[PDB]
Amino acid sequence: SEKYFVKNGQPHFLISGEVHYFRINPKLWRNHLQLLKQTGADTVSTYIPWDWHEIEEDDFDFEGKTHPARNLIRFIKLCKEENLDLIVKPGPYILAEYENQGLPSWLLKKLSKNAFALDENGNVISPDLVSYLSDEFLEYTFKWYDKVMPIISKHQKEHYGPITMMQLCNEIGVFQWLSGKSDYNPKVINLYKEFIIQRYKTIEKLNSVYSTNYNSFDDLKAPSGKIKLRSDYCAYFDFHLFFREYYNKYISILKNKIRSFGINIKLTHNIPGWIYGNASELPMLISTYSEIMKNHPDIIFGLDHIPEFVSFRNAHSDLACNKILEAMQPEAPVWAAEFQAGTREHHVKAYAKDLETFYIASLAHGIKGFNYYMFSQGINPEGKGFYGKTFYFQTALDAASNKLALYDSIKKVNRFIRKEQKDLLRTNVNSEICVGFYKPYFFTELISSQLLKEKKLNVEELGLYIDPRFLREEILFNGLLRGLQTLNYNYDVVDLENCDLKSLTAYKQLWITSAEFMDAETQNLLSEFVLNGGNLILYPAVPTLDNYLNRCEILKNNFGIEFITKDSSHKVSAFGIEDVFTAFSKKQIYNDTNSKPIAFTQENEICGIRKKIGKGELTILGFAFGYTSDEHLELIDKLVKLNKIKRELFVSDKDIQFVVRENNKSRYIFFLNYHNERKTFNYRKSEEISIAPFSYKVIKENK
Amino acid sequence: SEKYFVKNGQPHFLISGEVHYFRINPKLWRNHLQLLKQTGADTVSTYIPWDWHEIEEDDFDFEGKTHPARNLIRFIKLCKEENLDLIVKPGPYILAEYENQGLPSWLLKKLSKNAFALDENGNVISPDLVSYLSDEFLEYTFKWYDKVMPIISKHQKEHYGPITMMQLCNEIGVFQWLSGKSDYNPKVINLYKEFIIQRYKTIEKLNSVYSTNYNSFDDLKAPSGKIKLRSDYCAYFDFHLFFREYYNKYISILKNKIRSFGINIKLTHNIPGWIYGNASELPMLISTYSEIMKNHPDIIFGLDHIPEFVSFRNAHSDLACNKILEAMQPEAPVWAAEFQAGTREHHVKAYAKDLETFYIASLAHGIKGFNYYMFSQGINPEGKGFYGKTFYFQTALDAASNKLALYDSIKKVNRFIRKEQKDLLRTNVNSEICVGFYKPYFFTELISSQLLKEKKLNVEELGLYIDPRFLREEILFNGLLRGLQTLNYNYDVVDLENCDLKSLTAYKQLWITSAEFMDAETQNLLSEFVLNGGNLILYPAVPTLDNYLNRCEILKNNFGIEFITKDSSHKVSAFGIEDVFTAFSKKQIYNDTNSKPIAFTQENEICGIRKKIGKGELTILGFAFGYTSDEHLELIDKLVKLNKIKRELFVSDKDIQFVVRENNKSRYIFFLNYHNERKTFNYRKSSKSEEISIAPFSYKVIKENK
Ligand SMILES: CCCCCCCCO[C@@H]1O[C@H](CO)[C@@H](O)[C@H](O)[C@H]1O
Ligand SMILES: CCCCCCCCO[C@@H]1O[C@H](CO)[C@@H](O)[C@H](O)[C@H]1O
Ligand SMILES: [Ca+2]
């Protein structure tokens, strides 16, 4: 049933600690590895920075000849002597606050103009930022792989060495994201052209989808500027599809080159998206990897969790991210490639007592492995730090291997995990709620994001009112997912693309947060789901367009739905709940023939209905609510109770979060107190306990 | 000579609680007032919502004829009976999560399009957002004042009623700010044109300042779209000056109207700017009030503090905001018109254990009065709730007048304040550091802000590299002010406009965070300050332009500075601290003439110097640093130590914040732990050491008799 790492043919919780040899006094390398092993960690993780080892063009030092901390060979030997497995990450990009993001200075000085990412004007976006598929950049990357990969091959677990996993590059696309800007390098734009021709075959086919008027593919230009026309939305949508193929090509080139050295260990990649201690944009970033994950079943994606604190303000972020990774990668364990330990930022404090709770909550929220980032603080050698002298603060160990407060928290959590991993790794939550992941709503990193300065997407200019990023951030991430977690209802997330009908039928309810557009495949899937006996909850709109904003009303017509879009007060009543605040004046007003009306505008117009269709049930709400009032929790609760779904526990205090994890033999009840209040409460199945502020309690039951 | 409220010629700590009569069962009004009084609160505060009392056009109910909770008269009477003074806030805007922000539905339905705030295209920004000087808006506001003001007048203190203060409207500009669009209503356009003609007199004079070629004033439009030329920047700068005069006109019109009813009580206004539990944009909004605060000494501005949590993430916001209000309103006490009690929104928790610490920190940080907002929860009658039925959560009292957890925290704090107010209100901190408040850097709400939809200001397009909003947020608010508070160095903030040299010479150091532009008046003042014996710290730029980005090299010349702007690594060395990360590749490179070089680029070029000029000392750093690394705190500490400035206490844990307040008689030591760690530390006055244990997110106060 569950996916989990294995060691000695038993379920193994992967406990890795990040220790940057290149930022640590080599006299203290053994001491760091021993103190890490002494927490019950089984693995150590590090970058192998290209800049640090190719000290000049075609001058490699992996042996400490030119600086003791260039002795990668001895660090590998120390990992073996101290019985730690090793995760190695040779880039080419490492980021990691290393100057040039890990690329050599000699390389960046020597590359042509056309090797760099370019803005719509052909100007260099950043003196650190190459275009991934630059021939020059791949030439030098390959010459770097030519020296480091034989070292990694020799020490891989497949040759009985310590290296169990290797990360390819680092957070692909994170620069396109953090910078406003997309890459318009002429090589990238040529690949975009091949992609479009391959996709549409003829300009007449493209023209009928885009409503364009090209005489050939030679008239086709990469999209840029604000979207003003539906044709510009279409161009930008395919520009999004192209970049997912682009990142897949980049990672495929790295992988093929790696495999050519006989390296047969587990390959990895790491997902960015946390900022300011929430992860509402991480679903957009994980959507950029959609083609990699379809095409590479052997690359395990891990999450880069950066909570910064642990409270009701960010409690839902790590669960929603873990669940979305499970949706996109069901055949591999959910794990954190980077799992916050200390802080990257001196002024952004990371409290041991905060992180200890985050670690336990991560177990409740289904994590199967992590790498404490950073277990060990580093000191940047020879001004090679992007920022100051010091790399991370409030870690488990300082750069000189002094134990800090987090050390004892990590030892405590690891001791719990080692005691329980055999049973805990084989547990799941009983989810009767499925929440649909509709990937095209997330495909906006070029036109609409929290990090993009000027918005290229204003849906009002396209005759639309439901913005897909507002939907996926406020209605889905901070709304429905946050609400179900707060109400202690288990949900699973399912990717709707090429989705098996049989994999929706296990759930008593499927929840779809829908904009006005949705592809024919998904409209067909949801139609079949209800017709065959599924209970669907759909809001805030029955879709009437496809991803190209061409008419598509399959779901509408299959369900016998008619509506007019009409302006009204933001407040509606729904299931007898008065003053439900909704995001939009514009609401769908439903013909109620063969329907039960269950929501009403201030002027008593029908803005929600329930209906039987074939063997199934439909609940449509023509209005958008997130979680910004107690009425919103009341409405989510009412909806869940339409199909008689129960919480696993009665807990006397509604502000206590719990997760029940079980198999046939074992149950774990995780109680999580995300609040600055000592809480005393009791519980019983669908008895009294005190939890400190920002704290936890774990309870075992034999079934 | 602290500024504090006075009662019976004694120091009086203003303790108010907010209780919305219109959202509470009137059978429970008395119980809310009694329970508030029993916390030691002296005052109660409420809106009087226009929408609630003008139930239809020209149909008024202040007596509970149509709804018991419309009996404003009886609520006023109960405040008197329960020995509470009363703050009334009749709008016209109240916001307060009330439908249409307090404006009548019938009004918003009746008003013509020209009553509304309009974008650049002439479209309504929001259906509830009126243009402040709309003829139609002020006509209906006046008719609302015609009915509510005679009642307020009759129930003033001077007529033996309970009413001691009235707020004019609510957070002027907050609605425009949150909408992300500025008002281009034609009243605004026409008033701006009059402002520009009055300012420049002739199109030739405006052309010479802006470098434009207009044939007449008729060719000039209110600026719209992005700034691409220095002439666009000039136009926007005058538009900012115009908006400060526009808000002054609004509040003058309301004030003159109020005075005509024989209302002589203290008038208030309330400062917005906290969002997501920080206040780094509050300085921009308070700056929109600069002309109000110069023309109306009888209007007391108070802060609206919404911290939402109390941790290192936001510890610096309340002190910086208290200090900035003091800088702009030096003759009135610092007080909080709205002082967070519970939470306005269910999904953002307000813990008693956080807010109790915020209250104590506020005393440490010099607050002299506050109004707990919300003391009492409300339930919206008749669908009047903008966002839902319940108004506020986790308050002192639920809507039914049950005590909640916060009630005990407020009772504890108030008990300390009543015991200590006589000394505590007269206490000062010993600030040897003054930080300059240069208001023109904050004049960007039309072109650059956290909330503005459109980024109109890109200084690189003007041949500049120091963005004034980046400066005032990262280098000043989240940088220097945060770093000083974290290092436990007391600082004052002084408004540099029309600033007395006499009121800077008190300090050991004056710190100026400077962009490439600064007006002649300020450049001269800082010149005189150093020549006459002041110690100036100036970074990241010697300015060379005025506020219109024309040549002004007064300070550069007076200080005998030569510099070239050159690109280098972000990292510099300063005062022997290596790998100080700085914000810009571009830095000021100084030559070594009659100076001690104390900072060096990665190529060892001089990007900071110290020199003696007349009787004073100058330290210039040609690079930008806030507080984003440990080196930044080391650098701030090094700079403070240049003039032998010392902390009040040796404390063994550098992460403990403290404030020492004293007068002749009394010393209060405030310890604040903004961290999620139980801390055990020792301390001593810098003159055996005492041991203290402090819980997470907690406080200790020690009183000493001198
Ligand atoms: C545009 C300049 C890029 C330099 C910074 C790149 C790396 C910063 O670090 C990145 O920060 C993101 C935001 O918090 C996180 O989501 C990522 O996990 C993290 O690696
Ligand atoms: C665009 C619609 C705006 C309607 C008015 C909403 C007023 C919300 O309330 C305001 O929020 C601000 C941001 O936290 C605070 O700074 C203010 O103090 C507070 O009054
Ligand atoms: Ca029908």
Swiss-Prot record, chain A:
Record: residues binding beta-D-glucose 1: 171, 273-274, 344
UniProt superkingdom: Bacteria
Keywords: Cytoplasm, Glycosyltransferase, Transferase
EC number: 2.4.1.391
Effect of residue 338 to G: Shows glycosynthase activity only in the presence of glucose as an acceptor among the examined monosaccharides and disaccharides
pH dependence: Shows high activity at pH 5.0 to 8.0.
Keyword Kinase: no
Catalytic activity: a D-glucoside + [(1->2)-beta-D-glucosyl](n) = a beta-D-glucosyl-(1->2)-D-glucoside + [(1->2)-beta-D-glucosyl](n-1)
Residues where beta-D-glucose 2 binds: 353, 356, 695-696
GO CC, any one term: cytoplasm
Pfam family, one: Glyco_hydro_35
Localization in the cell: Cytoplasm
Summary of temperature dependence: Optimum temperature is 55 degrees Celsius. Stable up to 60 degrees Celsius after incubation for 1 hour.
Family: Belongs to the glycosyl hydrolase 35 family.
Classification via PANTHER family: BETA-GALACTOSIDASE RELATED
Function field: Glycosyltransferase acting on beta-1,2-glucooligosaccharides. Catalyzes the transfer of a glucosyl residue from the non-reducing end of a 1,2-beta-D-glucan to a glucose residue of an acceptor molecule, forming a beta-1,2-glucosidic bond. The beta-1,2-linked glucose dimer sophorose is the preferred donor in vitro. Has a very broad specificity for the acceptor and can act on various aryl- and alkyl-glucosides. Does not show any hydrolytic activity.
Subunit structure of this chain's protein: Homidimer.
Protein name per its UniProtKB record: Beta-1,2-glucosyltransferase
